[PDB]
Write a protein that binds this ligand. Structure first.
Ligand SMILES: Nc1ncnc2c1ncn2[C@@H]1O[C@H](COP(=O)(O)OP(=O)(O)OP(=O)(O)O)[C@@H](O)[C@H]1O
Ligand SMILES: [Mg+2]
Ligand SMILES: [Mg+2]
Lengths: 985, 75, 147
């Protein structure tokens, strides 16, 4: 009963069973500050049974530093009471409540308990109970630029999936008598020692088809071992193996036990001596708070720092921690005790929400047990940070001023950012910017662009949108929501509905870009990312890239003249199957799905386009007769869809669907088996239908079968949609019409001048004239995966399953078909929160203008295994040109709009280089090997005039520069790379 | 006797061989002259691909026959 | 992209391919029209076959789209000109030049691969009735690939 219309992207990460088990768990959250509200938001979007909040403390102004559900009108009201109303709106399937008081026994009502902003004594009291009653307990804390997470799921936690990867499967070539299993040619099994596999469709060793898992002993990238199969048989041929995943048992320790002997999780291996320091530091913080009526050390106060260090020494002595305390780091923790940053809150909230999901669903490997994190490299160094600057000013930014100071707040308030995209990452970035006060000054500004509209499936991870906003533009809704969150951003945000690409350069031109301070990408495709990267490289603006995929995520920073651009790195491309495999010899469900998609396009999209173009373009036939690769195909499509097979009712559509079923699932298979019989052999004597090639069998139409009826219904409905007829769904009409159908005879054909053009002309003149059909058009079918009433996915699923039945492939359901055909990218709210937090932690580094490349960090993480890693950016490559140091990426030549001859002479006389090729855009302006006449005609022209002449298109009035790529040779004839040229028009 | 091997670029290589010479020996000569590894040599005569372990006489190769040297590609 | 394409074009210009001649269409560097000369000792002889090459924007990180324009009677080439070449679909790597692709296509023309065909009827004729395949190939290359 999972609403797949809302959890479409999340189910591809978790699954149906995981979410079903998740919808029966109760989550209690203690503490409703920024971290608590972030955790509650992520949990509510996740889809747990219900959420309960407990925070009776009255609101204070500083709490607004990271609480985006609190407004200045709520000062003096308990945080939970004012937050429940806004949290209840995020998801309609997840009720949210509030409890005024907590009793120990009451804790038995909840599956998971999350604790934040609670003293250590209360945490011990809660854990001593929740541990022995088998209740998952998570404790999170955020102090300035430091964070801590602790997990305790009981002594006998059962983890079904430990890595989140799909079971490994592959095709076997031969299995010896000693269990040596070998993969097909150029095929890697990918198994690891100790894994369990099950075999099916094994020839020669039926005993392995039972399904009992067997141990795996990897012997190489192409072969492994399973043990002794002596009894079962001597040698097995072919077959498919599939990995089996066994549950694991994880034993946690209670908080009281784990204080003495903790088990750390290291987010980075460059600093492995810190977590022991933070373990003492946080306990010292708790003791100090207990000793001062719950008052944390004041910001950048020396006396409080000394007292905190004395507490740290006492704790270290008490716990027999044989570790020398680092005074600098501990006192830094003391200084930032009262800090409250929205970026750290978002990061820890995403992590803790993922831990809650792990606890509820018994999936993925959880943290075990202490996770201490710090982003201390983000502390500004170009401004004055002291007690005077960091003291509170009685404003909503106190939580951030306590870490960065007032001068850095002024620096942030005057930013002019440019956000590309308004998806999940875009929404999180806008929330973080609004909380941080970005562009709230006189000179500040924000620009957000996105051309897409809100859809139902987007509401699962884009919390700024509501069901009432479905169908509206993302940018406007996001801007309005963030303006509501922070009133100071009224009038400081601009929203565009423009796609960032070559066609939008009239809006995002030189004037628009010259005023920016940084660009943040929230895109989902590589083309736009590359384009924006090129624009930033040309204009020399900092860029922040971030990407997510399921539970994996990464963040990268591009700094002018310091690091390399986004395009300097290559990512694995999409896998496209050979045309021969798809056309005739499929062996996986993906091949059949691709074939079904091609069939859909060729049946309901291309012929309609040809018919429409014929009725519109007066000279379409002549152009097609010598331009298209198959004019006969176009003419046949036009004839069939206009006169020969034009339906007059829905019964004719049903008959056409039956005919197409016969055409594509019964006759082509017969022809293929006529060309290559099942007993045929290759040129080497081996059987033809062996290994990757599976022998097909024609299908006979059975109306009672479900798949056949589904295909008929979908095809008839789509044909009626094409011709605008009234479709029907009652099986009675289908069964009545298809009963009286006589299949035309079909016998495979063995085969065995210029008159063809005459036949083509005869067909062409047989078509009705365009003038006779004015105002008549056929509606093409544009593929749309997200709609379940257009029969697109239904048709694709039916066709794919029928072709799988042809080749004895295991059919898939509509869920997997939608996942594969639609190129759906799995997405999660927790991953989005984490990447937004990391990007906003890099943003403060960018604002401070840090120069060293070791101070920036590109981040990668995988939440299914609890892996976090950070590495320095790669420096931009250097080069030697004319005995000078040149940056390959961030350097360019600035020249006037001189003539081509003058440009060549300048490059010859100044750089001592001979120009051999000069191009602009996608046109070859000049090449050394061109005939002399062409050059003599082109040499004395200006660059702008040359570009206009060659590209046959006048330059736009808003164009102010030209980017030219030049390849030149040195005096000796050796090729030397040079930076591009920036011609100023 | 003498034979001719034509490459993809239109070049003709003349070889002095005997009808009893093995295909391996011919591939060795082609490797020595052009530097092409035997594994990547695809030798064709009269529409039939020469296979290792056989002799020229097995393919009825006689005085001044013409072979084709093409690359190994499958799919 | 542009620099790599121009380097390949210059390399073609410096050393003539003899049996091939590729060049940009008009002045566009992302659209080439190449020519292939049929192997002499094959049915596709005395023939000139025109191919269209479309370099993707991500070249050389994505394979170029190569399609025959002249009709050819080959088991691995269909009516639309699509070529059953492994180096153009999934075996592509940013280390293969256009000259290598043209040499591969010339080898393919030298000898088809009927065990993994793209046009089952032509492959069946080739495997069963060789003489009829030769006659049909000669007829097609005389009717279409000449003049
Ligand atoms: N070239 C582009 N210019 C501007 N905005 C873009 C461009 N390409 C993508 N976007 C926007 O980037 C955002 C990507 O976010 P996301 O992928 O989560 O959303 P979606 O594609 O609508 O959803 P889903 O992928 O889950 O079906 C979308 O708003 C999309 O409109
Ligand atoms: Mg969308
Ligand atoms: Mg998307």
């Amino acid at each position: 009963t999972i609403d797949e219309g809302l959890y479409s992207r999340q189910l591809y990460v978790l699954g149906h069973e995981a979410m079903k088990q998740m919808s029966q768990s109760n989550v209690l959250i203690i503490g409703c500050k920024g971290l608590g509200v972030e955790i509650a938001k992520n949990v509510c979007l996740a889809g747990v049974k219900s959420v309960t909040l407990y925070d009776p403390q009255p609101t204070r102004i500083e709490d607004l530093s990271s609480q985006y559900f609190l407004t200045e009108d709520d000062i003096g009201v308990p945080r939970a009471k004012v937050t429940v109303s806004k949290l209840a709106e995020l998801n309609q399937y997840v009720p949210v409540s509030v409890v005024d008081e907590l009793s120990t026994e009451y804790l038995k009502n909840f599956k998971c308990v999350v604790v934040t902003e609670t003293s250590l004594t209360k945490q011990l009291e809660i854990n001593d109970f929740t541990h022995k009653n088998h209740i998952a307990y998570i404790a999170a804390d955020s102090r300035g630029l430091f964070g801590s997470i602790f997990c305790d799921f009981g002594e006998n936690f059962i983890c079904t999936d430990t890595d989140g990867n799909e079971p490994l499967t592959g095709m076997i070539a031969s299995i010896t008598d000693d269990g040596v299993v070998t993969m097909l040619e150029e095929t890697r099994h990918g198994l690891e020692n100790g894994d369990f596999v099950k075999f099916t469709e094994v020839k020669g060793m039926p005993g392995l088809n039972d399904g009992t898992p067997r141990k795996v002993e990897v012997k190489g990238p192409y072969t492994f071992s399973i043990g002794s199969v002596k009894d079962l048989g001597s040698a097995g041929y072919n077959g498919v193996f599939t990995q089996v995943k066994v549950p694991t048992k994880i034993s946690f320790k209670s908080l009281r036990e784990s204080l003495k002997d903790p088990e750390y999780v290291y987010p980075d291996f460059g600093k492995m001596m810190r977590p022991p320091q933070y373990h003492i530091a946080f306990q010292a913080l708790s003791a100090f708070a207990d000793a001062h009526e719950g008052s944390l050390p004041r910001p950048r106060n020396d006396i409080d720092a000394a007292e905190f260090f004395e507490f740290c020494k006492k704790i270290a002595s008490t716990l027999q921690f044989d570790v020398e305390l680092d005074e600098k780091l501990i006192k830094e923790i003391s200084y930032q005790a009262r800090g409250d940053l929205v970026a750290m809150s978002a990061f820890l909230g995403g992590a803790v929400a993922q831990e809650v999901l792990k606890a509820t669903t018994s999936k993925f490997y959880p943290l075990k047990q202490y996770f201490y994190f710090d982003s201390l490299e983000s502390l500004p160094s170009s401004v004055t940070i002291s007690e005077e600057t960091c003291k509170p000013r009685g404003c909503r930014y106190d939580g951030q001023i306590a870490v960065f100071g007032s001068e850095f707040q002024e620096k942030i308030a005057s930013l002019s950012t440019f956000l590309v995209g308004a998806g999940a990452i875009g929404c999180e970035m806008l929330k973080n910017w609004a909380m941080m006060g970005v562009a709230t000054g006189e000179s500040g500004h924000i620009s957000v662009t996105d051309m897409d509209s809100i859809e139902k499936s987007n509401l699962n991870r884009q919390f700024l949108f509501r069901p009432r906003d479905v169908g509206k533009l993302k940018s406007e809704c996001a801007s309005t929501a963030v303006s509501i969150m922070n009133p100071s951003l009224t009038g400081k945000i601009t929203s565009y509905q423009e796609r960032v690409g070559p066609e939008s350069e009239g809006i995002f031109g030189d004037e628009f870009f010259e005023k920016l301070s940084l660009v943040t990408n929230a895109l989902d495709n590589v083309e736009a990312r590359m384009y924006v990267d090129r624009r930033c490289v040309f204009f020399e603006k900092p860029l922040l890239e971030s990407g997510t995929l399921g539970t994996k995520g990464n963040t990268q920073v591009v700094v002018p003249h310091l690091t390399e651009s986004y395009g300097s790195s290559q990512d694995p491309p999409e896998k496209s199957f050979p045309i021969c495999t798809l056309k005739n010899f499929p062996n996986r469900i993906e091949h059949t799905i691709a074939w079904a998609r091609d069939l859909f396009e060729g049946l309901f999209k291309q012929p309609i386009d040809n018919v429409n173009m014929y009725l519109s373009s007066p000279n379409f036939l002549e152009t097609s007769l010598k331009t298209s690769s198959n004019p006969r195909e176009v003419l046949e499509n036009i004839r069939d869809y206009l006169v020969t097979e034009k339906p007059l009712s829905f019964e004719e559509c049903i008959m056409w669907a039956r005919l197409q079923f016969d055409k594509f699932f019964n006759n082509n298979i017969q022809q293929l088996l006529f060309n290559f019989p099942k007993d045929s052999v290759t040129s080497t004597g081996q059987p033809f239908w062996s290994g990757p090639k599976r022998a097909p069998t024609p299908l006979s139409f059975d109306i009672h079968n479900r798949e056949h009826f589904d295909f008929i219904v979908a095809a008839a409905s789509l044909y009626a949609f094409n011709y605008g007829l009234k479709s029907e769904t009652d099986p009675a009409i289908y069964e009545r019409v298809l009963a009286g159908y006589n299949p035309p005879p079909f016998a495979p054909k063995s085969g065995i001048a210029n008159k063809d053009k005459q036949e083509l002309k005869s067909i062409a003149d047989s078509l009705p004239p365009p003038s006779s059909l004015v105002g008549f058009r056929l509606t093409p079918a544009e593929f749309e995966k997200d709609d379940d009433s257009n029969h697109h996915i239904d048709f694709i699923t039916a066709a794919s399953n029928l072709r799988a039945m042809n080749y004895d492939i295991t059919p898939a359901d509509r869920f997997k078909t939608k996942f594969v055909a639609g190129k759906i990218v799995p997405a999660m709210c927790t991953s989005t929160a984490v990447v937004s937090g990391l990007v906003c932690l890099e943003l403060v580094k960018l604002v401070d203008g840090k120069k060293k490349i070791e101070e920036y960090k590109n981040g990668f993480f995988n939440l299914a295994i609890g892996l976090f890693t950070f590495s320095d950016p790669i420096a931009s490559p250097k080069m030697k040109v004319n005995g000078k140091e040149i940056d390959k990426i961030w350097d360019r030549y600035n020249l006037p709009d001189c003539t081509l001859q003058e440009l060549i002479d300048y490059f010859q006389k100044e750089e001592g280089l001979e120009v051999t090729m000069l191009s602009s855009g996608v046109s070859l302006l000049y090449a050394n090997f061109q005939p002399p006449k062409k050059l003599a005609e082109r040499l004395p022209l200006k660059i702008s005039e040359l570009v206009e002449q060659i590209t046959k298109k006048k330059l736009e009035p808003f164009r102010k520069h030209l980017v030219l790529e030049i390849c030149c040779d040195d005096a000796n004839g050796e090729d030397v790379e040079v930076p591009f040229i920036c011609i100023k028009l | 006797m003498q034979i001719f091997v034509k490459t993809l670029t239109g070049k003709t290589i003349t070889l002095e061989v005997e009808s009893s010479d093995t295909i391996d020996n011919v591939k060795s000569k082609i490797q020595d002259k052009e530097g092409i590894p035997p594994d990547q040599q695809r030798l064709i005569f009269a529409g039939k691909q020469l296979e290792d372990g056989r002799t020229l006489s097995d393919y009825n190769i006689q005085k001044e026959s013409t072979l084709h040297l093409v690359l190994r590609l499958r799919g | 992209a542009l620099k790599r394409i121009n380097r390949e074009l210059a390399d073609l210009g410096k050393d003539p391919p003899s049996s091939s001649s590729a060049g940009p269409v008009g002045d566009d560097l992302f659209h080439w029209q190449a020519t292939i000369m049929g192997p002499a000792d094959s049915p596709y002889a005395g023939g000139v076959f025109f191919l269209s090459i479309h370099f993707p924007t991500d070249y050389p990180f994505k394979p170029p789209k190569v399609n025959f324009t002249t009709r050819i009677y080959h088991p691995n080439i269909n009516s639309n000109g699509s070529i059953c070449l492994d180096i153009l679909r999934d075996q592509w790597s940013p280390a293969l030049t256009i000259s290598k692709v043209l040499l591969s296509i010339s080898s393919l023309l030298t000898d088809p691969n009927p065990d993994d065909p793209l046009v089952p009827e032509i492959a069946h004729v080739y495997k069963t009735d060789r003489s009829r395949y030769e006659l049909s190939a000669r007829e097609w290359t005389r009717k279409y690939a000449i003049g």
